[PDB]
Design a protein around this ligand. Structure first.
Ligand SMILES: CCOc1ccc2cc(-c3nn(C(C)(C)C)c(N)c3C(N)=O)cnc2c1
Length: 465
């Protein structure tokens, strides 16, 4: 009597994309309980462990409870997917919220890091290491101002091989502990990462930085950072001392999460009354707004490139599936076949995680047919169904590209400088000669700035079109 995910949950909408897979907002078909389901495709992510080991982990994680740790409820596995069912949080990533404040101080930073250390300490007590700890993994419980922080993805790194695809590792290099690179690591790597996050919260820049991923890893691996920037003048010795102890090279000498919790800086700046000297850190908030925008734009760039490539793969495949089922040779089909075909795209592709059952397909087809000026129930021309169907998929990633572009263009200039692109393509790890070569060909008269149409053409060229 084996339990199947879609007998129990129905997908409502897509919340976003995390490490290892898609996150879908799901709903229990009997109780109406809402849940965020991480869908990990077995074809894209290799396991590092055996079946036994992972189930034992899942059982343990379901029994753990802490106010700063995402709550896991259920776990399903079928032939091509793992489904991790957790509590849904609606407050978004930490940094996205933080850029929307107009004021931020050492009291606010300290309240954040106390939360984080407190979830970590708890998990280390139960011998669970995060390993991939970074700002994207800190969500706020709700859209409330006073919202708690929940750490997501504890436990996954020990059982799943991380993606090599750069679309999946944007922004990991800044946070990873030297010893994780060399392969002998323990729980202290989580303190390093938190130490980095605190450095960024107090200055707005990463302690280890570089023009591309491998440059960033080389700094980290050397382990040298400095407090020499102007904005460190605004910050207590005490906080710098904690940072130093968290960013200590040799893990055996690095402070534990639990001893970090008792550190003077945390004690002083997390007492709710005393604000003995609490300047706003506007430079920090300004640098963080820039650093965040850069990342989210590179991220959306690569997901747009990926979506375009996925699209070409799926358009040609869907066309061939239909061309085959069309025994007539005319180009005409009906609703129930379009559905059988779309489904068979899914059986082969298995890329779309909001199509978690036969009923998700039915409704997608109806959304397509209701879009085209076509009776959803006479005989339809497959050619035009394929066009509308695929674009509808490129919507999410094309509209988000435009939006991450607008959000990056903070002065509403309409354009990004050649210097800004350099930073954008550095972070997306697209070779410099290669993007200059593409720019040169889009606008052959340009003067080191591109508008949105131009930028988008560059991306289409960088994925072979
Ligand atoms: C053992 C790990 O299990 C899970 C299960 C569900 C998860 C849901 C999330 C989640 N991601 N998001 C995005 C911001 C990426 C859209 C949420 N809104 C999540 C949530 N918990 O509401 C993250 N990690 C998960 C990890």
């Amino acid at each position: 009597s084996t339990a199947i995910f879609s007998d129990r949950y129905k997908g409502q909408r897509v919340l976003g994309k995390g490490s290892f897979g898609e996150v879908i907002l799901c709903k229990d078909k009997i109780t109406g309980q809402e849940c965020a389901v991480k869908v990990i495709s077995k074809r894209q992510v290799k396991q590092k462990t055996d079946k036994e080991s992972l189930l034992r982990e899942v059982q343990l994680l379901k029994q753990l409870d802490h106010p700063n740790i995402m709550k896991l409820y259920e776990f399903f596995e079928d032939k091509g997917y793992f489904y991790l069912v957790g509590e849904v949080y609606t407050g978004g990533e930490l940094f996205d919220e933080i850029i929307s404040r107009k004021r931020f101080s050492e009291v606010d930073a300290a309240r954040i890091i106390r939360q984080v250390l407190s979830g970590i300490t708890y998990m280390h007590k139960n011998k669970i290491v995060h390993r991939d700890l970074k700002p994207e993994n800190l969500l706020l419980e709700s859209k409330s101002k006073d919202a708690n922080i929940r750490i997501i993805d504890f436990g996954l790194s020990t059982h799943f091989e991380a993606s090599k695809k750069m679309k999946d590792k944007i922004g990991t290099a800044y946070y990873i502990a030297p010893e994780v690179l060399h392969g002998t690591y323990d729980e202290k790597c989580d303190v390093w990462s938190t130490g980095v996050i605190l450095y960024i919260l107090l200055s707005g820049c990463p302690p280890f930085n570089g023009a591309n991923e491998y440059d960033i890893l080389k700094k980290v691996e050397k382990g040298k950072y400095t407090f020499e920037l102007p904005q460190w003048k605004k910050v207590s010795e005490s906080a710098k001392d904690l940072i130093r102890k968290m960013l200590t090279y040799v893990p055996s000498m690095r402070i534990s999460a639990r001893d970090a919790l008792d550190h003077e800086w945390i004690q002083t700046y997390t007492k709710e009354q005393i604000s003995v000297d609490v300047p706003s850190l506007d430079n920090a908030i300004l640098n963080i707004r820039q650093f965040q925008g850069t990342q989210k734009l590179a991220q959306a760039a690569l997901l747009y490139m990926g979506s375009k490539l996925t699209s070409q793969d799926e358009t040609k495949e869907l066309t061939a599936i239909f061309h085959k089922m069309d025994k007539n040779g005319d180009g005409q089909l009906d609703r129930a076949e379009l559905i059988e075909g779309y489904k068979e795209l899914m059986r082969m592709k298995g890329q779309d995680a909001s199509m978690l059952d036969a009923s998700a397909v039915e409704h997608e087809v109806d959304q397509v047919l209701d879009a085209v000026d076509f009776d959803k129930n006479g005989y339809i021309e497959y050619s035009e169904f394929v066009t509308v169907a695929m674009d509808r998929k490129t919507l999410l990633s094309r509209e988000r590209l435009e939006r991450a572009f607008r959000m990056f263009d903070s002065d509403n200039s309409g354009k990004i400088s050649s210097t800004e692109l350099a930073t954008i393509f550095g972070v997306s790890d697209v070779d410099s000669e290669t993007w200059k070569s593409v720019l040169s060909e889009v606008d052959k008269n340009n003067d080191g700035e591109v508008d949105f149409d131009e930028f988008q053409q560059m991306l289409l060229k960088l994925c072979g079109n």
